Amino acid sequence: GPIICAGPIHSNKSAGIPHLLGYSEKICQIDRLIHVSSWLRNHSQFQGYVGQRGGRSQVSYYPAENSYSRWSGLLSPCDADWLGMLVVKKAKGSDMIVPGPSYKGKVLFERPTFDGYVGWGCGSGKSRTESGELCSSDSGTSSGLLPSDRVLWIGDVACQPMTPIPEETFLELKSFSQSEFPDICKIDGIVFNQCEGESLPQPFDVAWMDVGHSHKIIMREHKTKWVQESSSKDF
Amino acid sequence: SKCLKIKVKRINLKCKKSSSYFVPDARSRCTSVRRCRWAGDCQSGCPPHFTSNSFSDDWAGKMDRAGLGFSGCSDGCGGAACGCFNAAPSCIFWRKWVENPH
Amino acid sequence: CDEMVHADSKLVSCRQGSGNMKECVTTGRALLPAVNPGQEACLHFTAPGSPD
């Protein structure tokens, strides 16, 4: 269920929440999706009360199943930006969408890219009732609440603290990355191998991790190991 | 008047093809998902039924390099040395791949 | 090791990640005899690239 807090509903749309430094207090703010709204106010320059009775429990993902969603203690890349553990950017004009999810009434979503992560928003009133690039104006935005209609997320990604490693270890795994996939050479303009001409669009999925370099380490042959340990942050 | 001609070349021994078969180069690979007890709410009694074509534990939907690899519960370590903060046996699930590299 | 047979130089999957150090991948299977015990057997490999 809820983590620590069932954040209240605020009727006045103009809700000014400044920066906060308390570690435990800010969690309910994320449960209120205050960082999700702040991305809209910082980048879409639109102030809107997000997740009214929505919270984390009602955020929907393109895959229908996520066991890790049930585990509310898992940090998400979007929520890692309130703590600043990673970076997100504006939807570049060079980016083309993956036709996986159905974009009806949508405003903001995420994309795990091979270099980083990127946010996608557009005009208030202008709702994405279609999977197209644009968003047509709609009156569904008149109310202050869209119950995760404006919010949808991609992939069941885990995020946790990281201890740095020399890049030569990252290099040999990068060399190891090419060994297990001779069938690809280019990823979204970022070169992965060197071969003949290739067809640009392909819906393609492989497990991956981040370690803190420009490239992602992908795997189809790894194995996981879960351990519980005492850490002051996990309190 | 018209005519038709037939040429003959060789005498040889071959036979009919009843049915055609293909065999790739199978190679063993595997992954294990290491899950501690009370994390993921492991079944304290392993259920004999398994969703081996989905793997709800790990990415219920994905194309795999596998010819439907079977999964089995296993009795992992338990305790602080195992890092599961519990004496209960660990909860490890597994998958088989049958693949051809080249 | 008096017993050793070289690898096969036809199965080659090399990507030139680094100019100085060529990166190569190979798979397959091996067929070598066995010794009367008490030694150390070897297995040599080649490449279309000349030096290494």
Binding site: - | - | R29, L32, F45, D52
Partner: peptide
């Protein structure tokens, strides 16, 4: 006949002498 199976490997890429010296003895 000890034999092996080969997976997808990771195998990657001078001045010298004659450097010879003495011999030991056994045949057959």
């Amino acid at each position: 006949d000890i034999t092996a199976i080969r997976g997808s490997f990771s195998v990657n890429y001078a001045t010298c002498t004659g450097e010879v010296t003495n011999v030991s003895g056994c045949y057959s």
